[PDB]
Amino acid sequence: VVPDQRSKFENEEFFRKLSRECEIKYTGFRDRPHEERQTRFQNACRDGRSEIAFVATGTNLSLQFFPASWQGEQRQTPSREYVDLEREAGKVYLKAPMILNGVCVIWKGWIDLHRLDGMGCLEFDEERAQQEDALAQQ
């Protein structure tokens, strides 16, 4: 494979500077009474298109795990997968492999059902990164 893959990963410090354990919070109207904790979780769960950012950095990452549908006229039913992990630790979290202008990195933030100011570690360690980088070319 082209050696420009391993090279950027071993010399780019951008991983430790931001791809590390950082505080995270879901994007929503905090000025909306605590009522957003439940309504935002369910209404956002149907649209699994969560927007979230790192409190430490103004950086923001958008991601999509299993959303009911974009323009679909389906039902307003939520993502069963979201409540199959809400009953467990009593928290709601998502994990997905997103690619940036480089290779795949694993993003998996978590937050409790009431305070949406959890933590989320981000790190370049996807095994699909080494092979997808090779197959990244058309």
R_g over Cα of the chain: 17
Instruction: Please report which helix (H) or strand (E) contains residue 6, including its range.
Output: helix 4-11
Residue whose entry in the numeric block shows the structure tokens 């905090």: 30
**Domain, as residue range, for 102:** 1-138
| Spatial separation of the C-alpha atoms in residues 24 and 109, rounded to whole Å | 7
Task: Report how many domains make up the chain.
Answer: 1
| Spatial separation of the C-alpha atoms in residues 133 and 103, rounded to whole Å | 6
Structural biology method used: NMR
Neighbouring C-beta atoms of residue 31, cutoff 10 Å: 6
Expressed in angstroms, the distance from the first to the final Cα of the chain is 14
CATH of the domain at 17: 2.40.250.10
| Spatial separation of the C-alpha atoms in residues 87 and 10, rounded to whole Å | 40
Residue whose entry in the numeric block shows the structure tokens 């690619």: 99
Length of the chain (residues): 138
Neighbouring C-beta atoms of residue 90, cutoff 10 Å: 10
